[PDB]
Design a protein around this motif. Structure first.
Motif, mmCIF file in Angstrom:
data_model
loop_
_atom_site.group_PDB
_atom_site.id
_atom_site.type_symbol
_atom_site.label_atom_id
_atom_site.label_comp_id
_atom_site.label_asym_id
_atom_site.label_seq_id
_atom_site.Cartn_x
_atom_site.Cartn_y
_atom_site.Cartn_z
ATOM 1 N N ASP A 130 5.309 0.592 5.513
ATOM 2 C CA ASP A 130 4.576 0.738 6.787
ATOM 3 C C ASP A 130 4.202 2.324 6.664
ATOM 4 O O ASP A 130 5.155 3.106 7.138
ATOM 5 C CB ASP A 130 5.055 0.665 8.096
ATOM 6 C CG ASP A 130 4.342 0.668 9.352
ATOM 7 O OD1 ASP A 130 3.291 1.355 9.279
ATOM 8 O OD2 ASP A 130 4.730 0.132 10.219
ATOM 9 N N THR A 131 3.133 3.035 6.475
ATOM 10 C CA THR A 131 2.667 4.291 6.518
ATOM 11 C C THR A 131 2.100 4.924 8.022
ATOM 12 O O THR A 131 2.254 6.114 8.177
ATOM 13 C CB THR A 131 1.498 4.380 5.501
ATOM 14 O OG1 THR A 131 0.724 3.432 5.433
ATOM 15 C CG2 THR A 131 2.147 4.644 4.292
ATOM 16 N N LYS A 139 10.069 1.743 7.089
ATOM 17 C CA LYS A 139 9.682 3.079 7.709
ATOM 18 C C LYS A 139 10.672 4.222 7.312
ATOM 19 O O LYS A 139 9.998 5.394 7.235
ATOM 20 C CB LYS A 139 9.394 3.017 9.094
ATOM 21 C CG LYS A 139 8.488 2.077 9.778
ATOM 22 C CD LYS A 139 8.475 2.125 11.262
ATOM 23 C CE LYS A 139 7.636 3.499 12.059
ATOM 24 N NZ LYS A 139 7.558 3.454 13.248
ATOM 25 N N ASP A 140 11.902 4.012 7.150
ATOM 26 C CA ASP A 140 12.792 4.954 6.813
ATOM 27 C C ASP A 140 13.578 4.939 5.360
ATOM 28 O O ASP A 140 13.366 3.937 4.740
ATOM 29 C CB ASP A 140 13.962 4.877 8.111
ATOM 30 C CG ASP A 140 13.452 4.759 9.345
ATOM 31 O OD1 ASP A 140 12.555 5.491 9.912
ATOM 32 O OD2 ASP A 140 13.879 4.060 10.422
ATOM 33 N N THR A 164 1.400 -0.659 0.643
ATOM 34 C CA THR A 164 0.877 -0.227 1.968
ATOM 35 C C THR A 164 -0.427 -0.951 2.214
ATOM 36 O O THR A 164 -0.988 -1.275 1.415
ATOM 37 C CB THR A 164 1.079 1.115 2.105
ATOM 38 O OG1 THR A 164 1.459 1.483 3.569
ATOM 39 C CG2 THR A 164 -0.116 1.954 1.646
ATOM 40 N N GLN A 180 -2.043 8.683 5.877
ATOM 41 C CA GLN A 180 -1.395 7.487 5.212
ATOM 42 C C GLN A 180 -1.306 7.561 3.719
ATOM 43 O O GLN A 180 -0.146 7.097 3.399
ATOM 44 C CB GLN A 180 -2.292 6.392 5.758
ATOM 45 C CG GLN A 180 -1.764 5.547 7.030
ATOM 46 C CD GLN A 180 -2.533 4.270 7.357
ATOM 47 O OE1 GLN A 180 -3.495 4.070 7.890
ATOM 48 N NE2 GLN A 180 -1.538 3.329 7.364
ATOM 49 N N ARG A 183 1.657 10.050 3.301
ATOM 50 C CA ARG A 183 2.997 9.425 3.505
ATOM 51 C C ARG A 183 3.375 8.476 2.747
ATOM 52 O O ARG A 183 4.609 8.357 2.131
ATOM 53 C CB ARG A 183 2.653 8.729 4.800
ATOM 54 C CG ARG A 183 3.468 8.812 6.426
ATOM 55 C CD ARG A 183 4.890 7.806 6.399
ATOM 56 N NE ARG A 183 6.031 8.995 5.867
ATOM 57 C CZ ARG A 183 7.282 8.836 6.144
ATOM 58 N NH1 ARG A 183 7.713 7.758 6.918
ATOM 59 N NH2 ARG A 183 8.194 9.976 5.990
ATOM 60 N N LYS B 254 10.861 -3.243 15.582
ATOM 61 C CA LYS B 254 10.975 -1.896 15.079
ATOM 62 C C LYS B 254 10.459 -1.146 16.378
ATOM 63 O O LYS B 254 9.916 -1.341 17.248
ATOM 64 C CB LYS B 254 10.014 -1.302 14.240
ATOM 65 C CG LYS B 254 8.627 -1.492 14.616
ATOM 66 C CD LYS B 254 7.582 -0.911 13.212
ATOM 67 C CE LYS B 254 6.123 -1.108 13.671
ATOM 68 N NZ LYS B 254 6.002 -2.682 13.535
ATOM 69 N N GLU B 260 3.081 7.435 17.358
ATOM 70 C CA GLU B 260 2.596 6.450 16.397
ATOM 71 C C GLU B 260 1.617 5.506 16.668
ATOM 72 O O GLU B 260 1.685 5.064 17.851
ATOM 73 C CB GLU B 260 4.020 6.047 15.818
ATOM 74 C CG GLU B 260 4.603 7.095 15.061
ATOM 75 C CD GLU B 260 6.104 6.228 14.492
ATOM 76 O OE1 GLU B 260 7.157 6.148 15.135
ATOM 77 O OE2 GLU B 260 6.074 6.089 13.415
#
Lengths: 380, 382
Positions: A130-131, A139-140, A164, A180, A183, B254, B260
């Motif tokens: 997920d960008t 995400k992490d 992505t 994006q 990222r 999440k 965001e």
């Protein structure tokens, strides 16, 4: 097959072949095309489109969830298939036996699939990242490492790719697109070794930026000959051919006198001496009630749908007294005039994506390839 | 049968038995119920509703076009089926072999069908009369008599019925209803003899005027437990039981940080720390994009859809950290809260009829009877 009502859709597979072979020309020899064939290939026919696209240069296919992939396999497609969405850990053994690759985005998924599945087939996983889309994806950093580690550790789990998806690739303004892209380039470093298939691009980023798509393009809406947005249309490298059209025929024709009412709620009143035709399509066919003021084509002319649209029928104001059996084109070309899917979408206040998807199971698809009728698919 | 995505529709077939049985109680015993299961029984499953309805008191079935009637024969229904709409003259033969009655409304169709058919099976015809709906049907005495003659002359053509349909039967004000009923009464005198089945009523007309139905009613939308319109909801004789419900499950959870963005066109932006849930249902499932400012139920509570809807998934703002696998109800009850098809319909700015019809082939149907699962029907199933 065959059908016993005069309403049908036509799918032009030659248009789908050209939209694919032209990107196959515009992309590097290294780079694969993954044709996206989810949702019965956007309402055009899953097998018929999957086959046409693989002939045209695509090497892989993509679906939305597991039942769409098992359905392609049951129909004789033996090409690679990625499920882009989620699946149950308990169904990883089915995906494996049928050689369907799965999307992964959470470590607890794997932990669970690992307990349940011991082998003997390999299962190829694509890590979604997920960008900035906020839909699926890791995400992490330490969640990425934990996935890589749970895959590395299992004998039958393989990480074939990672990807992505861009939220705004159709948008003129590339500013969230370049956030994006950056990222992604950064998240790719949380991985030890870069896997064999790295992909990011939907139809929009793959026709706008074909070099910054790595080694696999997912190609969707533009395969069907539909632009990603109005805004992206004069920025695309080749002409797209439109594949879908929708037709029906007049089944009743009548002269109405003034003050005579038409359809539910009697909301249309005849004002002059009008010829009204009934066609056998309505909202259970996906021709939604909101198309009540829209123009279809009968004998080269625009003609308004008058009165409310019914479940299976609706009425139009005819140029004059036409014979029963006259072809009405709701999406498509009648000589001089054209209605495109973009036109229908304008009136329903949606995006084109939504329209062929909504034309229902009830409507047969007639397929054309090499300018000849190939096949009829009637769902009921 | 089986399915592999956590999105399904449930159809309660006990509700359908009650809605039809209550009508058999309400109507005179000499008046038959034609149950109308067109459009895959308004999106609920044609043969499952057809079998349930025929149990509760229905004797005939009605469909929109010939393929729907033939599909019911293949799945073992032996009851009479009427095709309410148009058919091809060439197909008269197949309809006659499979004991499907046909609607007729023009003599040129019969001229053409006499020529292509010559037994041995009878074709039962129901003449359609246009009394004010403007859709299909005869509007003249010369043409009514011509059809009847062309039917009388062929030995294998039989006039089993005669009908009309109302445009405003679901309006509190019955003025156009009354013109149309009176016009049917005049149009019926244009026929040499009355056929056995005279019918006019839909759900609204038959629930409101049970005595004014002649000998067959064509019961649709009220079978599924949906009111014909909200105007007549207080006018309804018995409570209606809604049969359809739509459900999903959380597949991703999440927390977002402030700033965001979520989904296509990155419309939505979280402003505090919020939990976002993803569900595997989108507009190719008939959960159309215009529902983007609506809500779903999660753990007995209302939760909004956040951002644009995607083809196969959409996002929702959660109350806090919920587990993956939590049932989400899109249409149905969760606790004290409820979302009905009329709610969805209002947000979509449509009638309730259009909502189960648009829930697509892609979404599995699980049938319940006697409060237990009876069968699963996945249309893209193996």
């Amino acid at each position: 097959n065959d059908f016993h009502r005069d309403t049908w859709a036509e799918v032009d597979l030659d248009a789908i072949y050209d939209n694919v072979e032209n990107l196959r020309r515009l992309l590097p020899d290294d780079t694969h095309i993954m044709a996206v064939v989810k949702a019965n290939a956007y309402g055009h026919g899953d097998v018929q489109v999957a086959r046409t696209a693989l002939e045209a240069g695509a090497s892989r296919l993509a679906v939305a969830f597991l039942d769409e992939a098992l359905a392609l396999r049951e129909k004789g497609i033996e090409a690679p298939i990625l499920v882009l969405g989620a699946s149950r850990p308990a169904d990883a053994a089915l995906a494996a036996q049928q050689r369907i690759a799965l999307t992964v985005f959470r470590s607890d998924w794997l932990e669970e699939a690992s307990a349940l599945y011991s082998g003997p087939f390999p299962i190829h996983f694509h890590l979604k990242m997920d960008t900035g889309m906020g839909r699926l994806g890791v995400k992490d950093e330490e969640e990425t490492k934990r996935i890589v580690a749970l895959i590395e550790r299992h004998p039958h789990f393989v990480l074939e790719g990672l990807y992505t998806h861009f939220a705004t690739a159709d948008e003129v303004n590339t500013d969230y697109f370049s956030y994006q892209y950056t990222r992604f380039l950064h998240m790719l470093e949380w991985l030890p070794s870069r896997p064999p298939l790295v992909h990011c691009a939907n139809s929009a980023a793959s026709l706008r930026f074909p070099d910054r798509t790595f080694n696999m393009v997912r190609f969707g809406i533009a395969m069907y000959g539909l632009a990603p947005s109005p805004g992206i249309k004069p920025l695309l490298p080749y002409p797209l051919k439109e594949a879908f059209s929708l037709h029906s025929r007049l089944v009743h024709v009548k002269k109405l006198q003034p003050g005579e009412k038409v359809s539910y709620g009697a909301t249309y009143t005849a004002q002059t001496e009008e010829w009204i035709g009934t066609i056998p399509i309505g909202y259970a066919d996906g021709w939604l009630r909101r198309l009540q003021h829209f123009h279809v084509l009968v004998d080269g002319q625009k003609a308004p749908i008058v009165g409310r649209i019914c479940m299976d029928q609706c009425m139009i104001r005819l140029p004059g007294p036409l014979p029963v059996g006259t072809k009405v084109t709701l999406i498509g070309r009648q000589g001089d005039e054209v209605i495109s899917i973009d036109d229908v979408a304008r009136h329903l206040e949606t995006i084109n994506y939504e329209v062929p998807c909504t034309i229902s199971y009830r409507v047969p698809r007639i397929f054309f390839r090499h300018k000849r009728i190939m096949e009829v698919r009637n769902a009921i």
